Amino acid sequence: NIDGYFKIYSKHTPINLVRDLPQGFSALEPLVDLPIGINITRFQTLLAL
Amino acid sequence: NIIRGWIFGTTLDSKTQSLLIVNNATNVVIKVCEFQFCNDPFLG
Amino acid sequence: NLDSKVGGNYNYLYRLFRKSNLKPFERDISTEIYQAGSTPCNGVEGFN
């Protein structure tokens, strides 16, 4: 969230491991960018339990 | 597909501007407004 | 004459001072006032 914008990058990959993040390389292509001008100090994930 | 949704703001209520990013598995939904919501979305 | 009236329009307000300088293109809608003194400020005719 910089210069009055908010950029999103995403990358999906399936794994067969349950231990930790994999020892691989992957770039993250841009997904979207919207102009929003509010400062952010905190954030929290949302779960549909 | 369990984890869906994000919130951002200073105090995260209706007194300050906040922007919300969510998903309900039919599309992508983003909201930016003075939204106050519970700490946990309860469905089902 | 477009935005001028004999009575006047008092809706236009400006912030004399705040806790810290507002960042460029950052909008703050809360009515918080700078805590200059140890006592709460609250914008009252108390301790400055």
Ligand SMILES: *[C@@H]1O[C@H](CO)[C@@H](O)[C@H](O)[C@H]1NC(C)=O
């Ligand atoms: C998912 O979000 C879209 C956009 O708000 C809405 O049209 C759709 O009905 C939602 N799906 C639900 C509520 O099941």
